[PDB]
Every structure is written in C-alpha cells, then in structure tokens.
A paper describes a structure:
The first group consisted of hydrophobic amino acids, including Trp240 (TM2), Tyr244 (TM2), Phe288 (TM3), Val293 (TM3), Phe452 (TM6), Phe988 (TM9), Met992 (TM9), Phe1091 (TM11), and Phe1145 (TM12), which applied hydrophobic forces on the peptide. To validate these hydrophobic interactions, we generated an hMRP5 mutant with six binding pocket mutations - Trp240A, Phe288A, Phe452A, Phe988A, Phe1091A, and Phe1145A - denoted as hMRP5-m6. High-resolution cryo-EM structure of hMRP5-m6 revealed a similar overall conformation to the wt-hMRP5 and hMRP5-Δ1-94, with separated NBDs. However, the C46-S64-derived EM density was absent in the hMRP5-m6 binding pocket, confirming the importance of hydrophobic residues in anchoring the C46-S64 peptide.
Residue numbers in the entry: 95 to 501, 573 to 787, 839 to 1169, 1179 to 1432
The structure:
Amino acid sequence: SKHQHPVDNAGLFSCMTFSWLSSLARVAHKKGELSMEDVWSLSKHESSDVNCRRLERLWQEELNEVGPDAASLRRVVWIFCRTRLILSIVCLMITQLAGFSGPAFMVKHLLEYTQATESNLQYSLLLVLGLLLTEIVRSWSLALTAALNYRTGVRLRGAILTMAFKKILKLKNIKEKSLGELINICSNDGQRMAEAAAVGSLLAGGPVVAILGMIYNVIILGPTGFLGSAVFILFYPAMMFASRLTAYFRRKCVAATDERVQKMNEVLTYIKFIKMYAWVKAFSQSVQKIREEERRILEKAGYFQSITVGVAPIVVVIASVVTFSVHMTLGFDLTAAQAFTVVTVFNSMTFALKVTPASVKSLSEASVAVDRFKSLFLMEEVHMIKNKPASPHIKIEMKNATLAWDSRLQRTLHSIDLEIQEGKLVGICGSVGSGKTSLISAILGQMTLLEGSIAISGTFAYVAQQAWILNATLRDNILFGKEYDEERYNSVLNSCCLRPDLAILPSSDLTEIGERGANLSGGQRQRISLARALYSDRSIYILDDPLSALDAHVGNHIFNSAIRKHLKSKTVLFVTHQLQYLVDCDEVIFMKEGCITERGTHEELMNLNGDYATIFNNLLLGGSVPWSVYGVYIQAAGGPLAFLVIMALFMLNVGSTAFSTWWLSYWIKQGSGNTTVTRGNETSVSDSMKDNPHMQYYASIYALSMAVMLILKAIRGVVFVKGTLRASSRLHDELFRRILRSPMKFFDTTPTGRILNRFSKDMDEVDVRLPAQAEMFIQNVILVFFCVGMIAGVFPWFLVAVGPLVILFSVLHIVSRVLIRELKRLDNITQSPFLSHITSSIQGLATIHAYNKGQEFLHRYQELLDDNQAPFFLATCAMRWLAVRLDLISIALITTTGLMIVLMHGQIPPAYAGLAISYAVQLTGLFQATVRLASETEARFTSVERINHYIKTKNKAPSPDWPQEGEVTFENAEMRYRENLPLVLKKVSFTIKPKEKIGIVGRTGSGKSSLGMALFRLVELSGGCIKIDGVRISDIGLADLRSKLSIIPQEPVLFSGTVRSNLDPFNQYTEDQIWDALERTHMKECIAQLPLKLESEVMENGDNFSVGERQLLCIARALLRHCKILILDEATAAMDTETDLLIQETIREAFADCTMLTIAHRLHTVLGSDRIMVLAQGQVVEFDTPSVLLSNDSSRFYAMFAAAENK
C-alpha cells in the first residue's frame, strides 16, 4: 500500500482490469447517486504541490541551461512526462503488435486448418486458446497503457494550472492580456493538456499497425498487395479532406447564426414595441429568410460530416474489392484463408481512423496551449519592495527616483523626494495623467527602478478602484483571512456606517455578492472595501479615491469617522480628487509632471498662491429522457414514415457491405464450376478459382456491388441530413410562431435570457451535435445487428451462446453509466467553484498583490483544483473500466465463434467459417462505442425536451375610414396586469375629444405606464369598456386594433439592418412620403450625405447614430402612417439646451392635427397643454386644464408644480 486511494493500493491485475473501481460502482448502483463524499481524495503522487514543484524545478533548470528566450516548454513537458510515457508507449507497442498478429497469424492458421482434409482436435484447441490469450493480453495491455497516461495527464494538468495561477498572480502587466484569456488558460488549457496526454500519446499507434499491414498482404499474395495499401493511403487523405471541408464549413455561417440570435434577442427584449406596432409578419419573414440561408450551408456541412461517421467497413470492402478484382483477373490464385487474411488485417488496421484524427487534434491543442503558456511565462514579474529606511520612524523613503512606467521604461515620474513619516494623513493630488496613479503603483511595487532607492517598512492596505472585491458571502470580505474579533468587527462597521446596509440586505452578514455585485452598488462596494481595509489593521494604508462618485455628506462622515480617528496611528495615502478632504491633513503635496512642486500643510498651500490654491478656489466656486421526446422528435421529423425510411436506408447501407462479403464468400466457395482442367497426364476436377468459367461474371458482380454500396452510402448521406434538419426547422418555426403569438405575460414572468437560450444553445445543439452522434449510434447498432445475424446464419447455434451474454450486457448497461452521469455532474459542480476564485482573482490583482495575500489564494486555488480533478480523474477512469468489461464480452464472443468454427470442421465450407471469424474480430470496439453513443444521444435529447413543452404551455366590422375622428372615452375601465395581482385600473372614466394635447403624468406605480398598452389591449381587459370614435375597442381584430394607432416609447429603439427596413419593414410606403416625413422632422441633408443614400446600414440599437439622431428617428417614425392617437412616452430627460427644444418643436409640429396622449414625467415639458389629467393610484382626480388647475392652490397639480420649481 502507498496511499489511501485504492488506485495506489491496486497492484498489476487490479490496475489492468480496473478492479478498484468496482467498490464505488456497486455503491453508486445501489444508492443511485454519487456525492463528493463518496469520491476518494486525490493521491499524493498526483497532488498539485509535488508535481508543481517538479515542473518548476525543470523549468528553472532549462531556463538556466538554454536561456530565457531560446527555451521550449514542450521540452519541459516531455521531460516531466517521459517516465510515465515510455512505459505507456511500450505497452501500446505490445498491444498493437498483439492486435495485429492475432488476425494475421491465429486466424490464418485456423483457416488453413479448416481447409485441411484431416481433423485435429488438440491443434484446433491450442489455436483457439492462443488467439483468446492474444486478444485478452491485447485488451488488457491497451487498458494498462490508457490507465498509465490517464494519471500522468491529470498530474501534468494539476502541476501546470497552479503554476499558471502563480504566474498570473505575480505578473506586473495586468492589462497585457484580456479577461477572456487569463480565465481560459487557467481552466481550459489544463483540460486540453490532460486530454492530449490521455489520447494523443497514441500517435505511434494506428500509423504503426497500418504500416505493418502494408508490409503484410505481400507474402501470402504477390505484387497485388500494394494496391490494397495504395487504396488505404488514398482513402485516408479523403476522409481527412472531408473532415477539413466540414471544419471549414463550420465557423462559417456562424456569422449568419449569430445574426439570427441577435435578431431573436432584439425581438424578445423589444417585444412590447413590436407587438404595439403590428410588425410581426415582416420580422417573421426576416427570421425565416435568415434561417433558410443558415440551412443552406448547414445542409452541406451535414452532407460532408455524414460521409466520415461510419467508414469503418466501407474502406475494408473497397480495398478488398479493388485487390481481388485485379488479383483474380490477372491469373493469380486465391484461397479462402489467403483471401480472408487480408480482410481480417484490414479490419485490424481499421482501428486507426477512430483515434488518429483525435490524437492529431489533441496534439495541436497541446502545442498551442504550450505556446500560449510559454508566452505567459516570458513577461516581466512583479516585485515587492524589501529595503527599509535607515530611520525606523520613516515609513516610505525615496530620493531622486526616476521610477519609469512600462509600455520598456516609460518616463512618468521625475525627482520625487517623498519623506513619509509614520502616522500621517498626507494626500498626493494632481492632474489626471501627471503620475498620481503611477506614483500609487510605484508605492505598491509594480514599477521598475532605474536611479535611486525605494524603502518600505510596512505592509500596504490598498483598496483598488471599481471595487473588485471577492465572490463570496459578506463575511469573509471584511476579515480577508484574519481572525474574527467581535469588538474589531463592530468598530469597523460603526466607522464605515455599514449598519443600514446590513439592515436593508436580506441575509445581512450572510448575504452573497458576486464578482462584481448583483445586489450591490458602487457606493456600497466602496464602503465594503473601506471596511475591509479598516479591519486589515496594516501599517501603511494606500487609500485610492473611495468617494470619487460615492457621496458628499456620508462620504465626509465616514472620512472624518474612520480616516481621521481610526486611521491616526497608521500611515494614510488618501489620493484626494475633491480637495476638501485635506483641511486637517498634516502635509499636502502637489506634484505635476512627476515632480513635487509644493509641500507642507494646507496653510502654505494657500498662502504660496500656487496651482493647488487655484484648483481649490475653482472647485469651491463650482436526467432520464421519457418516451415522449423520441416520439415527438420523429413525429416532427415527418412521422413514422420518415423514421421507417431512414431505418430502411441505414439497413440497406449496411447490407451493401454485408452482401459484398457474402458474395466474396460465395465466389470462394463455388470453386472452379465443378469442371475438369487438363494439367498434363492427370484430369481430376480442380480446386482453384482461376479455372471457373464464370469468373468475369463474378468480378463484374463484385464491382457492381461496390458501386451499389457507394451509391447507397451517398443516398444515405444526402437523405439522413435532410431528415434530421427538417425536424429542427419545423420545431424552430413552431416555437417562433407560438412565442410571437403568446401573451406578453409569458415575457414578463419568464426571463428573456431563458427564452433566448432555446434559440442560441438548444437550437444550435439540435442542429449540429445531436444528429451527428445519432447517425453514428444508428450505424453502429445496425452494423452490430447485421453482423450478429449473419454470424448466426452460418452456425445456427450462436443465439443460445449470446443470450446469456446479451443478458450480461444489459446488466452491465443498467449497472453502469449512472456513476458516469453522476461523476460528470460532480465535475461540473466542482469546476463551477473552480471558475469561482479564478474569475475574481484575474479581475482584481492589484489588491491581492498589495495585501500580500498571494499564498492563501494559491493554496485555495490548489485545493479547488484537486477537488475538481479527482472527479475528473474518476470519470476518465470510468470509461476504461467500462471498456474492459465490454471487451470481456467481445473476446468471449470471438472465442465462442472460434470454438463453433473448430468444432464443426468439415461440415462448413472454409469461406463461411472465415467470414464468421472476420466479423467476430470486427465486432471489437463496437459495444464500447455503442454505449457511449447511446449515452451521448440521451444527454443531447435534453435540449429537445427543453425546447418541447414550450409550444404546449368578427362581431364588429370596422369602417374603412375608421377612425374618422380622434374621440377617446373610458367607461369605468377595470384592468390588471396578471391574475392574483394588485389592481392598476380603478373605475377610470374620462373624455378626450379630438384635437387635444393630453399630458398624462402621475406617481410611480399609479398606472401611468399601464396606459398606452392598456389602449392597445396588450393583455385582455378584465372589466369596463373603452370606446374609440363611438366604437368599442373590444370585438375587433388584433391587426385592425393595433394598425390605426401609433406610440413612441420612452427609450428610442432601432432594429439592425437597413434604414429603409426600419422605416418601412413591409415595403409598401412610397419613398416620397418617407422623404417628406424626414423633411418635416429635419433629416434631409444629414441623412442624404451618407455614401449609400439611406442604405448605410444600422447596427444594434443604432450604435452608429448619435443619441439625438436615435431619438429623431423614432420621432420621424409613426409620421408616415399619419395615425390619429399618439401615446408618445417620456423623453428620458432633456438632451442639451437646444436638441430638446428642437425635438419638442418637431413633435408638436408633426402631430398637430390629431390627438396627443403624450406621457411625460417632467412638469416643465408638460406646460402649455390643452388639458391634462392626473391619475393617482389608478383614479382620475384632476381634470380642469393646467391653466385653471394652476390658479387653484388647493389642487394637487399646483403643489407638485411648486415643489418641482423649488427643487
């Protein structure tokens, strides 16, 4: 025994057969759920610390030997992994030698014995035992070499991830890389390296058995054997070519699918505007046009992908046909054993296309990860000041320090003579870019030194800008790895006045805040950072501006409560940006261009009449998938007929190869037509296929069988893709149709992102991932069924031997895959906390570096890495554990087939026995693929299930001229937003009459926002009646209702595409009317100067236009329709001193001859209206015209107007 982990306790046989996992497999099967407690802890050999130390030692050794610039991290990886890679390579060599010598020798000798006229029992038994032993030791050696590299990949990932984390923690240039790269390299590069070391180490595998096969087939045959090798070496860079073509088709049309996702997001977020404008048909047409363009390249991508999914038997059949059709017709002889040895070795070399491309892609990923890690390891490292001042009273000492920045020595500071003393309240103020932040960073230690010296005699309590903080509960953010003291905690809370924050928070001390703060604000974040700094109890406090945008009153209160009183015995480096915080400061310094100009306390600062005094004066002045899915999936695919057609086509595709093999066996068995050939003085029939009179007929039938197989494969490839894509298209169309027609309440309750997830992730998965795995699963299942049926046909006793084996396979399947699903779930729910403490760590590094808490952070990161890697290691080992048990069935089937062949010697033709053993040795590696494909399809069906259930859960004839007038009346309308919700409309009744300027305004939540969509009938009326032009709103069609109405929302909304498309999506309005509307809204010149003349294209939300132009575009909208009732919402504050007035001028100039149901929350912009109503809590209380309402002081509206004037 070496460790508590059963992996170390396992010897040779247990490790080879993965017997250690059958102590957790049983408990997982019995309980049905695997938790982190049941998962064994990581071994000390695979522990992060030891492997990281070894990797660092090797890296430093190579850096010292070769050089910082000429070193290679690939050499470091090779040196680290050589010990566990050499033995794995040897094991792969021996297992691939056994797997090649099995069919080449054991099958050939067995078939030669079958053709022999004698009958030997001991020899046949010895041959069967030898073949069984060879296959058993091949499978076991493969399992051993997989387990050997699985551990070293995990240990390499663990060693490199912590080293990368330490490097990014100790780097100086935080902004050198991006946010999405530092997190990716510490979370995905390690996994890429692990999977590379796991699967790509077999690069010396498939190729070596392939070249061994090429060397073979030339001794038994003649020169014809080179044609079989040429066929393989031309077919490989054809499946590779198809894979490259499908990869090129991928990452293409991704722009189209991103445009579709953006359009769906725009139609979901701005669904109120579209539903209030009847712009549904045009948007639906737009998305249909985008989708049909997407599934025009998606169809080709699927066509090219479906070629290389099941090529395992097709390549062997093609090579055999090409070899035999020219070997027989050239006069050469061919026997059953001679012909079937080539087929068996071709099937053996077939076990390269499944692994080699994956190995190459893993090696490429490992190489690019190594290059990126090397680039990470070559940047400058941050430094910490260790020199101390000669006088202990001096805290920070620096004399004539250049202290250049980086870009590299970027000169920013010049001749700084700081003499900071212990216990001071100084402040370094200056212009932006003069070197204030540069000086702060230099004090922290992230600055290089050229001339002078830097002396620090204490730790830094530095708070960073933007308040990065941590990503945990609001208790460790204040302690920051310190002992919890009640008195200190209460003092810190009282100093920073955090009691109201705790009171308003739901969980108070237990409240959880994200990396940036979800239920938090900038001021609260800064207060939390200040509290953490106060509780830190350090010597020097590097106080970066905490109150730049926090507040004034409470900011001064916390400043004079904590910085002045609590922070008296500690050094203060408070940056200052307002200049009233240094009235009590001990020494005020003002530095410009990196040089100190004024020193001393404040009194000298004003009496010297410097720049600081001028600035101060200026500032003072200023799961299981049910059967419903499978069924509906196929029902959406076209019903039972489509599934039956697909199944029949797959069976025909497999049966093409099956019939080719059967015809080859028939040609071998038929002999020379039972004719006699004169070989001299003896004439006694013949036993050579070359003497068969109908040899050309057999060759032609073989060639036709190959052609038919190719045609069937092409037909399946071009049909199955269409069948699996039409289902996705129909599902997407139905989902869009039901979502667009669904009440708005579905949008208010269900989040927009949740709906969008069904069109960006679920839809893409359904389109590209699930059909790909389903095709291979179906192909493997049909191939296995056909092989089993044909094997049983030759010997009518395979069913009785396979029945118990089928039961064993079913028992294995039900026992397993549960510890796989649970292990994957555990890996995900341990990697999510691994993304925690990583995204936060990269987001904020200056605070960590200044506080010197880089050791406990690294320890926590290593602990998280180990607790995430252990489930990953177990999950990786589970695949090989299942593969061993499935091989225990595969080799058993092969042994049973061989025993049946040897027992029935003389009653079975050699070709029939040979085909059986060829298919038996072809059965290898099929159950392992089949179960994995079934599990993957079951997992992928969760997306289809999530998509599903979403589609599950006249009277009055309007006049052609309606509305002739703009008369609006309300008859005690009763309305509510949703059921079981507080009422928003309470017996509201009023009269508008055409030609009005209603200036509706009320308190928040009173019901002002309800009006608008209330008139448009976004949700059905719960009571009351509303009449337009004497006609009730109800009992009218949706288009008729929301087609003669217009409204401009609060925030301008613009759709991506074309300006013409935004102005006229239906394309039925004349250009002259559009230009007249633009002229009336004052657009003309500034929009006519565009190079494309209004076809200039608009980005998302109109990001290429100014805010004023964005508002003016929406103002110009609804002018073309010349609608009567306008329900223009709030203008979202005033824009400048002229743009707002111009907008108002255009607004009243355009909509002058019609009603004006404008809603504005500003009392200054509502003045001059013809008549204004005031609605409070859903009741009308004031209808008497602003003017008349004004004279009356008792009216509320006058009180609000006076309050607004006062404020």
